[PDB]
Design a protein around this ligand. Structure first.
Ligand code: BMZ
Ligand code: CA
Length: 223
């Protein structure tokens, strides 16, 4: 996250870190046994880490659970990142409390202008790298589809939305992929992609979760 602030330990209780020997993507806990992330974050041997603040120090509220199965969206296209969403089922259910809790899926899609909270352990610099050990947060608005397609001609589909600042300086970044975009207590986006990070007129692009609620609910019900 570039231009954000330190969230504070366990104030984003649904945030998870996907680990394969190291942190490589974020995710969101939607119920005690399922996590949603970005399809481009897929790999085998994923351990899901809940209740994390500093990912290099066991501070006491962590739950490390391995995934039993991963389901990448049937129409995921890795060249265009269209339908960049995946579900991960945990081998055992997590113990939910105030520091580890699930986030609700949306009943309606959010409109441009809505302010949301984006979080993650990704790079904090636009040029150069500095990965934080503790969770960073950014409050950003969803941009209109017109501004979004204007910033990324020929690359935005109905399954994506842009959120951020056209002026630059504040954005999610590498290492934040797969994480949450929460607006009014509902999970509306998944950090997906961007051109660089926090550059002027290049806002972040997010998977539009409201378009996958039926697929998520049906998949969970049968697996
Ligand atoms: N500017 C952004 N909003 C952004 C967000 C997540 C990203 N994730 C990545 C990324 C880069 C290389 C490999 C995997 C990634 O998720 N770039 C990213 C850029
Ligand atoms: Ca920790």
């Amino acid at each position: 996250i570039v231009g954000g602030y330190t969230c504070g330990a366990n104030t984003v209780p649904y945030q998870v870190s996907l680990n394969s020997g190291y942190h490589f993507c974020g995710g969101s806990l939607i119920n005690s046994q399922w996590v949603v992330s970005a399809a481009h974050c897929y790999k085998s041997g994923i351990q899901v880490r809940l209740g994390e603040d500093n990912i290099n120090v066991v501070e006491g509220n962590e739950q490390f659970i391995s995934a039993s199965k991963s389901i990448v969206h049937p129409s995921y296209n890795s060249n265009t990142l269209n339908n960049d969403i995946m579900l991960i089922k945990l081998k055992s259910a997590a113990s939910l409390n105030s520091r580890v809790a699930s986030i609700s899926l949306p009943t309606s899609c959010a409109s441009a202008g809505t302010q949301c909270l984006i979080s993650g352990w990704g790079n904090t610099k636009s040029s150069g790298t500095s990965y934080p050990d503790v969770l960073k947060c950014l409050k950003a608005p969803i941009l209109s589809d017109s501004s979004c397609k204007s910033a990324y001609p020929g690359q935005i589909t109905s399954n994506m939305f842009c959120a951020g600042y056209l002026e630059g300086g504040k954005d999610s970044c590498q290492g934040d992929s797969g994480g949450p975009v929460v607006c009014s207590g509902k999970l509306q986006g998944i950090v997906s992609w961007g051109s660089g990070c926090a550059q002027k007129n290049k806002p972040g692009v997010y998977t539009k979760v409201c378009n996958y609620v039926s697929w998520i609910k049906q998949t969970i019900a049968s697996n």
